Amino acid sequence: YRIEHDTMGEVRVPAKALWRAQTQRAVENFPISGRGLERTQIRALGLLKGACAQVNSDLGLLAPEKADAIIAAAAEIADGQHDDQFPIDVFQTGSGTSSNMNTNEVIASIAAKGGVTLHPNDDVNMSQSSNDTFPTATHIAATEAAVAHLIPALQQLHDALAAKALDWHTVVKSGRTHLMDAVPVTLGQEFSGYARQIEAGIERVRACLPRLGELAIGGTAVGTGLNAPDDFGVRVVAVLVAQTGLSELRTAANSFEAQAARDGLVEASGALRTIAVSLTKIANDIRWMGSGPLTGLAEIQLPDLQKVNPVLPEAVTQVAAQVIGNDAAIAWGGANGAFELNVYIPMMARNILESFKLLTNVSRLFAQRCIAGLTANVEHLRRLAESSPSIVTPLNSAIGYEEAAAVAKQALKERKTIRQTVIDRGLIGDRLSIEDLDRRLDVLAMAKAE
Amino acid sequence: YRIEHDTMGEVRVPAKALWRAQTQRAVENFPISGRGLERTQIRALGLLKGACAQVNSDLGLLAPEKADAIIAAAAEIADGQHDDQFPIDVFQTGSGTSSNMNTNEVIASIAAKGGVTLHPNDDVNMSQSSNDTFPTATHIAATEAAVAHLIPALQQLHDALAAKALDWHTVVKSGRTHLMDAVPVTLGQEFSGYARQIEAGIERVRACLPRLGELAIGGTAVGTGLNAPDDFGVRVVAVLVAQTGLSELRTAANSFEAQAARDGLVEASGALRTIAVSLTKIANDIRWMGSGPLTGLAEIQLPDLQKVNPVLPEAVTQVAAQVIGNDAAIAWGGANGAFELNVYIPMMARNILESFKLLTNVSRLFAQRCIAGLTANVEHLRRLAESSPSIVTPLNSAIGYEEAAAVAKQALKERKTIRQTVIDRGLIGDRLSIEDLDRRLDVLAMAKAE
Amino acid sequence: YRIEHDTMGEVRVPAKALWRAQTQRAVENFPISGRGLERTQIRALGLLKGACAQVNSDLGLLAPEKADAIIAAAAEIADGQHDDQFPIDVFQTGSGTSSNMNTNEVIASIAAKGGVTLHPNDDVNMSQSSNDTFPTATHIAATEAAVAHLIPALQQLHDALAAKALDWHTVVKSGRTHLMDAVPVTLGQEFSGYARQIEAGIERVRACLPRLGELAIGGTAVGTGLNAPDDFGVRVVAVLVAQTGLSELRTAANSFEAQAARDGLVEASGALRTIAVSLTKIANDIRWMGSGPLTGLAEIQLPDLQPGSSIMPGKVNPVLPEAVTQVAAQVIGNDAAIAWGGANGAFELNVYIPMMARNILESFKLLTNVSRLFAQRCIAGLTANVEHLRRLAESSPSIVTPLNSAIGYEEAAAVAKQALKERKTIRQTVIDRGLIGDRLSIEDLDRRLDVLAMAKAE
Amino acid sequence: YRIEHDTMGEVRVPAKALWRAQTQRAVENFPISGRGLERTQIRALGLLKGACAQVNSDLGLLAPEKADAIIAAAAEIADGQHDDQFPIDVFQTGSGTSSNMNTNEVIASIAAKGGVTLHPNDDVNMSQSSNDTFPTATHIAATEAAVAHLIPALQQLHDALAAKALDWHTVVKSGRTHLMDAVPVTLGQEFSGYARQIEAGIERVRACLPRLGELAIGGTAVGTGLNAPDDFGVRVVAVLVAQTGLSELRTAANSFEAQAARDGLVEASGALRTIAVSLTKIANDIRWMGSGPLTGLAEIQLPDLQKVNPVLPEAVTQVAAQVIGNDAAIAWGGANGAFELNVYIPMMARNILESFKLLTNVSRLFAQRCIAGLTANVEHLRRLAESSPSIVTPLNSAIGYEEAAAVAKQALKERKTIRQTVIDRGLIGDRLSIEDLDRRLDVLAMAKAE
Ligand SMILES: CNS(=O)(=O)c1ccc(OC)c(NC(=O)Cc2n[nH]c(=O)c3ccccc23)c1
Ligand SMILES: CNS(=O)(=O)c1ccc(OC)c(NC(=O)Cc2n[nH]c(=O)c3ccccc23)c1
Ligand SMILES: [Mg+2]
Ligand SMILES: [Mg+2]
């Protein structure tokens, strides 16, 4: 209910609110989505403000009393004690200056409860600009999401898929190409392909980390580092690596590229989009294999969570669609920078951090509550394998290339199986027993598993 | 922390939660995004459950005391009193069955507090299925968002752009093509173009409403209407039209197309994506025309809300990026239906309803706090038009294209008007009077303004 | 290899080439894709230059013998006689001025072969600019593609789908929701849904034509109409509508909007993208229903079009559904390229026109041609596996619901369990549990378990 | 016309055509786009057919005289002598079966001219399927395009941008953030940022090559390798590496993943889409820097190729839009595989090969005919930097905020340098010396450049 005073008039701020006038003005300016920064973004901004205060204190630019108060207040924010103190819309000034100032004001208020006076700009924002802070917090959050959350979740899914690839190594079935009956495969072979797709997904995330982990901090307003110490960036990054354990964080290769563009987020989103494409194929194959039971393929049974509807495959395919959409928004913002600043950072941050979160959470649920509990309908799968087309090649050593070719042509002409065409042509004899025919054409042998 | 008993056993539900066991199971099954239904889809689910109870009562299928209890509870949900009673993630079973059951459970808990016992399935879900209700609610929410909120917001922006077009009718300036100087226009003419883009946007939204307003209700599980009265659909739609005033709501032309596909949302997103494209052009031009104050175009001054940064053009271009991403997600879900049900409905609903909300809110903000307060640097704009090499063409018939090109070169080098350069070069004679010069170089006449 | 002189040097030009120095400069400047304008864009540039000459002649601005030479030359271009004379890359100056000048030069060279000297700029480009012509030709081409080609092809597919809906009106089968067994439908009902998606697609194309048909012609360099007659736009549109029969063409509502933006192409692409979404669902369902035959759903048989495999000689694949789904993917890609160019205009001109024109006209062409092939080579010849589909419907646990009021929902569920376990029809299972008696005759069982009546067919 | 035959019977084929029955059926089945395989794709199919015949001959499965005839025919195809004999549409069967048979039939017809009888399926397609040959030919073409064409084109553009970064190292100018005047930078620093974007693009392409270079060859119909030698793939890949010098070509890690999905093309397209995003930023900035010559920024002059219109920036930004569109088509195909085969290969191949070609060709043109020739308006750039309100801040501690604001306002109004305004306002002596003024306002020192 309390009032504050701003160099354009009077500002009313809620009573239990640690934010001040600049934040309140941003609240009134951007009532667009009704959604603010996520826990991960707030955490990153607190981590960054603590590291900046630490470096400003080490360089003798900030009195140690003020630094200690900023560091303690920032630690509270990084630990999630103030997630309710960040009310600014995602759809704000495109630098993220509004959220940067929100962090400065909340730290100033937390410090005042402890008896220390901080200026949000001159103290909490010392050596920083309105323009190198929010992109840095974005890349911290995205790198933490990749390394600490997504990669382990994808590994859990990979390991679940790989476990089925081994458990079903000899569970023969019919191949399907173009949705049509094809030569035999095993259910384990198919799952070995799903596992490879997730393993390649982890490789793709790893491959983007050298650029995703680049931080703009130290570049200040335009990338030149004016009004910051020359080594501010390298010193702040070392504090962040030590606090977070994220060795993937690093100073930008080029301080102009790191502020004029967000290409690292565009690159990372392409890795997440590829994983969404992989997850769509895996999830679609799994719900088709589970389909029916009478009208479908009925190859496997999915665990029942809610005739079991494939509710986790539907959650996975819906997440994949969202990641594809978010990826388009990210590329659109990425392309539209101008001169020294890309001003799409809040929108790009929301979208990539959501894509990380959705893929992390759905991959773990898919792994644990769908893949791990799948059961194969082994006898049904063998009946499908025993209904696949056969080939004459494995008879060559027995009947010769010429008789084999005549078997092939007559089977095609009369729409008969290879097996029955061999019987009908009277080839069961010294060259070939019925047991020899059955060994040579065995559907597990045709799958070339063992 | 109260206890409830399901098929599969025990489940704890918060004390003050009005949802029951099936919602709490869905909370446990889908911890993916941490974002549930928006206030417009919760409202629509309420409007729909009220209308269904009305019709079941009208047809003598549901006891009137039970129908009255449903209608009273549904009106509270429609009025936004229970937005906190819908905790299920967007990324749920693709039919939206979980959120349909959430609505049925919340209505039964509200009715219970007024002394009336309702069965969530047998009473609140009477005549309905898990597959025709959620997409009906989605199309009610989207139609209401288009008619009641977006069209009026767009008309407000149209009227602000049109008002500036009139105020700046004679504000002559340099045209620009390929970013290069061109013959004269007025700011009014440019703003008349912006206004047409927004008027055409309203035409595009109106043009999608015949199909956006199609409702699946009555089609039950697969579109056949098995286990509903034959006229359930037309009765429920008529009650929704009577109660909401939305005459755009209609029973679907084909009950199978209305459940197998969500093509109406794909179509409406296309209109929203086109408006986003328009708004990007308008917002980009306005921030470029405000660029400066020294090294940019310096054509206009934007009202200062937060070096006056174009923060509302940034909000508008970020919203447009989000609408473009959401549009890609919607089309992806739309294409991937199978047989009798498209199972991407929760993801498509989130995206379409967000696109409507963002465009509505940012259009009003852009109109009121950017467009209405723009001010033109009238003298600068006319002096540059009068100094541009582009305007020497109408001198050619008096002094020839070679002397006209010398005038253009000296005017630019000396930063003089074309008029002053022609006088300084001693061209005023019988060949060319001062009055013929002023006629030939009348830049506002060159713009050909009404 | 004849040589020419531009206001900036000498340029070598092929001997049989009707283009001249500005076009040859554009050829050397933009070796990017190796693809130029399509027949439909060249036709529209010819129509436009012919109409402009007719109007300039009627207004006393262009000498009659010069106008007549332009009209004759422009008719040859519109008739597809010169599709080899437009070598400039699609990825050219973003106004399309290079292609505008290509048209003006080729007309000048055609007129020269009949003894008339035309100045490419002063005669063939009279009353026009480098900025209002190419987007006009783009919108002519797109409107013609929508009205004369896409809508008729979509109508042919609609009619083929609707004919199957009528033929299969009693072909009962189990519904599928979430890919799981559901209550009965008919294959005619499902095909009625596909028909409605195509009919809605035609409605979406129609709804965009009031803005797709808006032409910029007459707005000249910046939209103001400086250096054109005040009524040049309405006069040229009148001639184009009269000669083409394209009733949807009109002068832009706002001459600035018509050059600063290409929002009509973005709008129209959304309709094509929605059609691509519909065709994806239709084509996917059809290839699933054709799947197997032994390991798939085997609901229908697609006409055989070509051998599928040398390793599996009998195998035939759903090649038309695959062409349709691949076209749909291309339309979705093209749609993203069009929106991208549409958003990025500046001030008086959008400079993405050649790229947006390539993408929109290609989407029109691919959907037109694949729709006709899908209708003729796939839908028309489909056959239903009627006995298969009825057997599954009659054995479905989903159909026990109508027994509730005779034997109660618990005995109905037990019938479902036993049927599904013993691979029996519901009818037979009801019998094998001795439930025929006082509550339920054998005729009353046959009424309740009538799967076609449960589909509720009209 | 002549008569040819396949397993479905008799087909009329143009008398002179080198293709046979299956190609002609495909000509009639797929008249959709009117465009067929590109040179690069026909080249790869020829390389692969030759390598397969070499390995079949080395394993004693194919007669040396037949292998020689195939290798010679395949060489003519790879060289481009028969591009007119590949009439099949891009939009064909989704495995590329039709273009595989086109290659087999054309090789058979060429071999027949030389008096050798080859069966298109039994000899030219020995040990092969379409399912492994067409994606192998697609990944050979894409890997070649990446390594031999795109990376060298991007290196040329990087080197032109880096040459400018050096040439313009001391060309001081106004920074611009939010399109608004900011503290100084140099054109050199801006160009260093563009150079980094292109170097990072090269790093993105190199990071995708471990998976783009994976070939399916040897997996035959379903991934199992049925009807091929167990080492067919390792042997064919060694021949292709020897013949192409592309060490990036490798056996697939998993034979099922390599046929059930095309994730490597989706991944590579992501890299191309990021480069398009970068090139959009670079081209936009360059055309805005060239804007004018009177009413725009007038920072640089572009070389004149056709009011010098920025035609190469326009070509670059149109190419970028096409790469973004193609990228969406590729991802859509990538996701929609089923079981053992993704059947979007011809469409995904068209799009990713086009994206490689357009970026290759436009990057070389941009580097040579735009970047190399730019000239800077050095005096204008410095005068505006020296005249900008943004550089008054370092005076704050000598003259006070109020007087720094008055200096900035007078400098803008009079169009004077900040240095001359401070002198004109009488502030030298009291507040600071000339030596102090020249140190505080040195715009090249403020850019942190020397
Ligand atoms: C003179 N200071 S001012 O008024 O405050 C001012 C501010 C901003 C400006 O462009 C953003 C300009 N433009 C110009 O000086 C335009 C111009 N005219 N004539 C030339 O020969 C020339 C040469 C190179 C570059 C530009 C030009 C002038
Ligand atoms: C002076 N003719 S010129 O050199 O040929 C020229 C050309 C182009 C320009 O901007 C594209 C400019 N800019 C300005 O005049 C900048 C400017 N300075 N001071 C003012 O008080 C002012 C007020 C309103 C708008 C701009 C200003 C100047
Ligand atoms: Mg580490
Ligand atoms: Mg079956």
In angstroms, the CA B139 to CA B214 distance is: 7
By C-alpha distance, which of D125, D115, D94, D87 is closest to D6? Answer: D125
Beta strands A375-376 and B2-5, pairing class? unpaired
Contact (CB<8Å) B291/D332: no
Backbone angles phi, psi at D147, to 5 degrees: -80, -50
CB A210 within 8 A of CB D199: no
Contact (CB<8Å) C179/A294: no
Backbone angles phi, psi at B246, to 5 degrees: -90, 90
In angstroms, the CA C323 to CA B143 distance is: 35
Beta strands A9-12 and A172-177, pairing class? unpaired
The catalytic position among D5, D139, D149, D178 is D178
In angstroms, the CA D60 to CA A94 distance is: 67
In angstroms, the CA A274 to CA D273 distance is: 13
Of all residues in chain A, what percent are helix, strand and coil, respectively (each to 5)?
Answer: 60, 10, 30
Which residues sit opposite B251 in a β-bridge?
Answer: B215
For a pocket test of ligand 2, which of B380, B384, B390, B414 has the largest count of ligand atoms closer than 8 A to its C-beta?
B380
In angstroms, the CA C198 to CA C281 distance is: 11
Residue type, B112: A
In angstroms, the CA B385 to CA D321 distance is: 33
b vs e for B379-408, b when ≥16 Cβ sit within 10 Å of the residue's Cβ? ebbbebbbbbbbbbbbbeebbeeebbeebb
CB C104 within 8 A of CB C49: yes
Instruction: Respond yes or no: is residue A178 known to be catalytic.
Output: yes
Residue nearest atom 12 in ligand 2 by C-alpha distance: D295
Rg (CA), chain C: 30
Distances (CA, A) of C309 to A381, C293, D106: 23, 15, 18
Beta strands B300-301 and B375-376, pairing class? antiparallel
D350: Cα within 13 Å, side-chain hemisphere: 27
Residue pointed to by tokens 């719900």: A287
Contact (CB<8Å) A273/D331: yes
Residues near ligand 1 (Cβ within 6 A): B 294-295, 412-413, 415; D 294, 297-298, 377, 380, 384, 415
How many other CB atoms are there within 10 angstroms of residue D333's CB atom?
Answer: 31
By C-alpha distance, which of D249, D192, D258 is closest to D224? Answer: D258
Say what the alpha-carbon torsion angle D327, D328, D329, D334 is, to the nearest 10 degrees: 90
Q: Which residue of D has its CA nearest to C94?
A: D314
- Interface check B266 vs C, CB under 8 A: yes
- Experimental technique behind these coordinates: X-ray
Backbone angles phi, psi at C404, to 5 degrees: -45, -55
In angstroms, the CA D244 to CA D46 distance is: 12
Which residues of A81-211 form beta strands (DSSP E)?
172-177, 180-186
Structural domains of chain C ordered from first start:
2-128 (1.10.275.10), 129-398 (1.20.200.10), 399-454 (1.10.40.30)
CB A256 within 8 A of CB D192: yes
Neighbouring chains of C at 3+ CB pairs under 8 Å are A, B, D
By C-alpha distance, which of C373, C372, C364, C284 is closest to C330? Answer: C364
Give the one of A93, A306, A326 whose C-beta lies nearest to B314's C-beta: A93
Of all residues in chain C, what percent are helix, strand and coil, respectively (each to 5)?
Answer: 60, 5, 30
By C-alpha distance, which of D321, D317, D328 is closest to D351? Answer: D328
Distances (CA, A) of A316 to A327, A371, D257: 16, 12, 19
How many other CB atoms are there within 10 angstroms of residue B302's CB atom?
Answer: 21
Give the one of C179, C292, C309 whose C-beta lies nearest to A288's C-beta: C179
Ligand positioned closest to the Cα atom of B387? 2
In angstroms, the CA A408 to CA B25 distance is: 56
Is the sign of the CA dihedral C323, C325, C331, C333 positive or negative? negative
Residue pointed to by tokens 């290969």: D345
Annotated ligand binding at C316? The verdict is: yes
In angstroms, the CA B19 to CA B88 distance is: 10
Tokens standing for D420? Answer: 């001359």
Residue type, D50: G
By C-alpha distance, which of A251, A250, A246, A261 is closest to A218? Answer: A251
Say what the alpha-carbon torsion angle B219, B223, B228, B232 is, to the nearest 10 degrees: 30
Angle, vertex CA A148, rays to CA A146 and CA A152, nearest 5: 85
- Interface check B388 vs D, CB under 8 A: yes
Which uninterrupted H or E stretch holds C417?
Answer: helix C404-421
By C-alpha distance, which of B110, C447, D355, D253 is closest to A201? Answer: D253
Helix H, strand E, coil C: the string for B165-227 is HHHCCCCEEEEEECCEEEEEEEHHHHHHHHHHHHHHHHHHHHHHHHHHCEECCCCCCCCCCCC
Which residues of A121-191 form beta strands (DSSP E)?
172-177, 180-186
Residue type, A78: A
Chain D residues with beta carbon closer than 8 angstroms to that of A351: none
CB B208 within 8 A of CB C207: yes
Beta strands A250-251 and A300-301, pairing class? unpaired
In angstroms, the CA C354 to CA C347 distance is: 18
In angstroms, the CA D351 to CA A109 distance is: 55
Q: Which of C41, C272, C311 is the best substitution to test chain D (most D C-beta atoms within 10 A)? A: C311
By C-alpha distance, which of A11, A22, A135 is closest to A88? Answer: A22
- Interface check A163 vs B, CB under 8 A: no
Max alpha carbon distance in chain D (Å)? 103
In angstroms, the CA D61 to CA C346 distance is: 65
Angle, vertex CA C333, rays to CA C327 and CA C336, nearest 5: 145
- C-alpha of residue A287 to centroid of ligand 4, in Å: 16
Q: Cis ω on the peptide bond leading into residue D293 (within 30° of 0)?
A: yes
Distance of alpha carbon A354 from its chain centroid, rounded? 9
Q: Which residue of B has its CA nearest to C401?
A: B227
Is the sign of the CA dihedral C371, C372, C374, C375 positive or negative? positive
SS3 for B67?
helix
CB A252 within 8 A of CB A331: no
Tokens standing for C35? Answer: 């693809």
Distances (CA, A) of D313 to A338, D276, D282, D284, D285: 14, 12, 9, 7, 9
In angstroms, the CA C446 to CA D188 distance is: 87
Angle, vertex CA C89, rays to CA C15 and CA C103, nearest 5: 60
Chain D residues with beta carbon closer than 8 angstroms to that of A205: none
CB B254 within 8 A of CB C192: yes
Contacts (Cβ under 8 Å, ≥6 apart) of C438: none
b vs e for D77-99, b when ≥16 Cβ sit within 10 Å of the residue's Cβ? bbeeebeebbebbbbbbbbbbbb
- C-alpha of residue C13 to centroid of ligand 2, in Å: 46
B295: Cα within 13 Å, side-chain hemisphere: 29
By C-alpha distance, which of C225, C228, C160 is closest to C376? Answer: C160
Residue pointed to by tokens 């001639």: C239
How many other CB atoms are there within 10 angstroms of residue A16's CB atom?
Answer: 9
Residue pointed to by tokens 């025990």: B10
Distance of alpha carbon B33 from its chain centroid, rounded? 23
Ligand positioned closest to the Cα atom of A293? 4
Q: After which residues is chain A broken (C to N over 2.5 A)?
A: 306
